[PDB]
Amino acid sequence: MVAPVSKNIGFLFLELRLDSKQQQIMDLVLKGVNAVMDTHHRNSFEPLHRGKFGAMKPLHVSLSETMMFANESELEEKMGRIRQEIRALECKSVPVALSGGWLVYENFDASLQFLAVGLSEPARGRLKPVLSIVEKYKPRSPVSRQPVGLNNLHVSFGVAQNAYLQQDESVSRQRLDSLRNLVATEASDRLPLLRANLQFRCHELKAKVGTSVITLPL
């Protein structure tokens, strides 16, 4: 069939649309990181804020794991109840800001390594009511190995292929840990610039509902 996996799946997130200045800042930051990757013969991080023809692509804050409901109608009803419960909050908007240094997250099959920065403490705190609403409605049997919560809220800014994906797991983990050290020690000088400028106020959430993306106003 068509989309047999994604038909019952929902996922909640914040959409971060970069203005022209934020785009230029991320161009500059990632160019400096990738110069360091070149120097050290590592894979480069593809910038996540630009697509084909340099078209701007929004970044995101994931707010839920991949949620697999019993059928498509249950997915749509639960997403609608999340939409209403989020509207019912006093929240007119949620702020997004980052703090700390570079983090590198591996995806579920270790093929991709995401260069990211964690959300600042007040930004994570403002999302706790939203995260509670998600926890109330998510399916009890998870299909993701990585749950999404206050402890790992982040924005990813670039993504590299794991060159050691098909090597021994110990070799790949050693290369990932030295990569984490490498970007932190050698490619951190523009993080104050990134943290000062990659700040957002979101007036709505987004959800992937099956194959579609819908908007949940605050």
Per-residue contact string for residues 53-92; x = within reach of ligand U5P by CB under 6 A:
---------x------------------------------
Closest CA to 104 of 26, 161, 36: 161
Near ligand U5P by CB under 6 A: residue from 106, 163, 184, 197: 106
CB of 73 to ligand U5P, least distance (A): 27
Q: Does 152 bind ligand U5P (CB under 6 A)?
A: yes
Q: Does 114 bind ligand U5P (CB under 6 A)?
A: yes
Near ligand U5P by CB under 6 A: residue from 39, 108, 142, 150: 108
Q: Does 199 bind ligand U5P (CB under 6 A)?
A: no
Which span (34-42, 81-89, 146-154, 210-218) binds ligand U5P, by CB under 6 A?
Answer: 146-154
Was 41 annotated as part of a binding site? no
Which span (152-160, 163-171, 176-184, 187-195) binds ligand U5P, by CB under 6 A?
Answer: 152-160
The pairing of strands 9-16 and 204-209 is: antiparallel
The CA-atom distances, in angstroms, between 132 and each of 34, 137, 193 are 38, 9, 32
Please work out, in degrees rounded to the nearest 5, the angle formed at the alpha carbon of residue 206 by the alpha carbons of 200 and 211: 140
Was 152 annotated as part of a binding site? yes
Which span (37-45, 49-57, 127-135, 148-156) binds ligand U5P, by CB under 6 A?
Answer: 148-156
CB of 113 to ligand U5P, least distance (A): 9
Near ligand U5P by CB under 6 A: residue from 99, 146, 188, 199: 146
Contacts with ligand U5P by CB under 6 A lie at: 62, 105-108, 114, 116, 146, 152, 154, 156
